[PDB]
Every structure is written in C-alpha cells, then in structure tokens.
Amino acid sequence: TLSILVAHDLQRVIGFENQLPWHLPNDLKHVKKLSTGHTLVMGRKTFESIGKPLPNRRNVVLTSDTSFNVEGVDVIHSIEDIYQLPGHVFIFGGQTLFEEMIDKVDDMYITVIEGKFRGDTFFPPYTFEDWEVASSVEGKLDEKNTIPHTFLHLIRK
Numbered sequence: 690t691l692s693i694l695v696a697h698d699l700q701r702v703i704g705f706e707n708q709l710p711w712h713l714p715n716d717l718k719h720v721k722k723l724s725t726g727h728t729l730v731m732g733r734k735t736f737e738s739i740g741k742p743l744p745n746r747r748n749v750v751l752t753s754d755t756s757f758n759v760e761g762v763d764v765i766h767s768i769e770d771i772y773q774l775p776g777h778v779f780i781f782g783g784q785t786l787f788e789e790m791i792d793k794v795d796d797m798y799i800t801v802i803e804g805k806f807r808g809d810t811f812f813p814p815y816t817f818e819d820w821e822v823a824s825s826v827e828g829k830l831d832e833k834n835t836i837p838h839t840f841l842h843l844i845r846k
C-alpha cells in the first residue's frame with residue numbers, strides 16, 4: 690500500500706520556513722501510531738527539518754545529492770524507486786513530494802488543521818469527488834493541543 694500522510698490547514702498550508710506552522714503534539718502522536726513499523730519516504734528538505742531519522746520505522750530520503758549517505762536512512766534518487774519499496778509506504782512530504790505523488794497514491798491520511806496559518810508551502814488542491822471518506826475523527830483538544838483538527842482517511846474512488 691502506498692499512502693500520503695499530511696497535516697494541512699484550512700487553505701492547505703503545510704509549512705513555513707522549513708518547519709510546521711503549528712504546535713500540535715497530538716498530530717505527531719498520530720504520525721507515530723500510523724507509521725511505526727512501516728516506511729516513510731520524504732524529500733531532502735523535510736529530512737533536514739526533522740534532523741535525524743524517526744525511530745522504529747524505515748526512513749527513506751529522496752534527493753539528487755549523490756553524496757547523501759546518512760546513518761539510519763536509506764536514500765533513493767528517483768520517484769520510480771518508491772514503487773520498489775516493500776510493505777506499507779507513506780509519502781511523508783514535503784510540498785514537492787506531495788505534488789509528485791498525489792495522483793499515484795492509494796489513499797491519504799490527512800490531519801486537517803482547522804485554522805488559517807501563514808505558509809510558504811502547500812498541499813496540492815484535491816476534490817472529494819475523487820476521494821471517499823473512509824473515516825473522519827475529530828481530534829481531542831486540551832492544554833497541550835489547542836488547535837481544532839480532524840483526522841481524515843481518504844481512499845481514491
């Protein structure tokens with residue numbers, strides 16, 4: 690299975706200055722629960738943003754840099770390399786990866802951040818005409834998690 694994993698806001702913002710525009714611990718927990726034991730494929734910028742591979746899953750980085758050889762990270766140099774990765778593969782970002790993959794993936798696990806943030810990077814437009822809502826779950830709010838959010842699982846019709 691090949692899936693997208695993304696958090697985007699009401700206007701599809703995903704990032705600002707190479708980081709998330711929001712602080713939302715529960716989204717990171719969501720990411721952990723979905724991708725632990727599986728494979729993440731991410732662009733080079735997203736990798737440098739996190740700074741180190743995420744534990745307990747396969748971290749795959751897409752880059753043109755032939756000198757890229759980082760401990761605990763597997764490197765690929767082509768989109769086509771993605772299709773040879775075994776198991777459940779999550780396209781993990783960022784904008785460039787999402788743009789390249791949205792037409793190719795089986796499904797998407799989206800965290801809709803129900804606010805409007807300043808962004809410099811965006812998830813591409815998509816329409817519910819193309820995507821069945823397999824589930825929609827409101828995130829729970831508290832002192833640490835104060836931005837309303839909804840976890841959507843969309844499956845291509």
Ligand SMILES: NC(=O)c1ccc[n+]([C@@H]2O[C@H](COP(=O)([O-])OP(=O)(O)OC[C@H]3O[C@@H](n4cnc5c(N)ncnc54)[C@H](OP(=O)(O)O)[C@@H]3O)[C@@H](O)[C@H]2O)c1
Nearest residue numbers: 695696704705707708732733734735752753782783784785
């Ligand atoms: N909210 C979210 O769900 C989420 C998730 C992840 C990231 N983000 C945000 O997304 C933003 C980063 O997105 P971005 O588009 O600027 O960067 P990115 O997608 O993370 O990385 C871009 C880099 O990926 C490599 N790449 C992509 N396609 C390639 C291909 N076909 N062949 C070889 N290399 C390829 C290139 O690396 P080289 O230049 O090294 O060749 C490219 O410069 C940040 O603001 C970050 O915080 C948001």
Ligand SMILES: CCOc1ccc2ccccc2c1-c1cc2nc(N)nc(N)c2cc1C
Nearest residue numbers: 694695696708709717720735738781782800
């Ligand atoms: C690019 C900045 O995003 C950060 C920064 C630090 C993180 C630390 C732990 C887990 C995820 C992190 C994320 C992060 C959060 C994400 N959240 C969702 N819903 N989807 C993705 N595809 C994500 C991808 C990344 C990389």
